[PDB]
Amino acid sequence: HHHHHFNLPPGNYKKPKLLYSSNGGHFLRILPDGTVDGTRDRSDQHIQLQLSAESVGEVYIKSTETGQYLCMDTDGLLYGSQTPNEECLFLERLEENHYNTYISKKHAEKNWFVGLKKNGSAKRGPRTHYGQKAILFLALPVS
């Protein structure tokens, strides 16, 4: 019993990626202090992310520079943590036949997405929904 479709994006997790927001052109960033935002600075050391699978279509998203995992708490706020738990698994799905989206597995029934606003701020889960621009990502090679 899923609450979501199962169209998966092409590709694999062999190499690190930049998660590029086509909304405002920011890369997803996990800062050393555990806060999460976006930056247009392609040379930023905290935007290189290693994704890895749990079950098919499930991913962890980890900062290569600090070892922090992307997590979403019970208010729907993104944060970084050294310790991955159930709050740090996302359903990776194809969207609009092209982009990646990342839904909180823990809060999947709420349709809470990872998202980045045009101003480079992270969205909060309850302020996201299908059909928004801020939830659409591309996973770009770092090299």
Brief synopsis:
By secondary structure, this protein is an all-beta fold. The chain has strands at residues 17-21, 27-30, 36-39, 49-53, 58-63, 69-72, 78-81, 90-95, 99-104, 137-141.
Give an overview in words.
The chain has a single domain, classed as Trefoil (Acidic Fibroblast Growth Factor, subunit A). 0% of the residues lie in helices and 34% in strands. The chain has strands at 17-21, 27-30, 36-39, 49-53, 58-63, 69-72, 78-81, 90-95, 99-104, 137-141. A four-stranded antiparallel β-sheet has the order 4-5-8-9, with no helix packed on it. The protein is globular, with a radius of gyration of 13 Å. Its main location: secreted. It is found in: Secreted; Cytoplasm; Cytoplasm, Cell cortex; Cytoplasm, Cytosol. GO terms for molecular function: fibroblast growth factor receptor binding; growth factor activity; heparin binding; integrin binding; S100 protein binding. Residues 117-133 are annotated as: Heparin-binding.
Rounded radius of gyration (Å): 13 Å
Read across the widest sheet, the strand sequence of neighbours is 4-5-8-9
What name does the CATH topology carry?
Trefoil (Acidic Fibroblast Growth Factor, subunit A)
Question: Main β-sheet, in a few words?
Answer: 4 strands, antiparallel
Order of helices and strands: EEEEEEEEEE
Indicate the proportion of strand residues: 25-35%
What is the 3D shape? globular
Number of helices: 0
Q: In terms of structural class, how would the helical and strand content be classed?
A: mainly beta
Helical amount among residues, as a percent range? Answer: under 10%
Oligomer: monomer
The figure for the number of domains is 1
Q: Please write the CATH class name.
A: Mainly Beta
Q: What is the second-level CATH architecture?
A: Trefoil
DSSP strand count:
10
Report the end-to-end length measured between terminal Cα atoms: 38 Å
PDB class: protein binding
Keywords: fibroblast growth factor-1, cysteine-free mutant, FGF-1, intramolecular disulfide, protein binding
Assembly: monomeric
Entry title: Human fibroblast growth factor-1 C16S/A66C/C117A/P134A
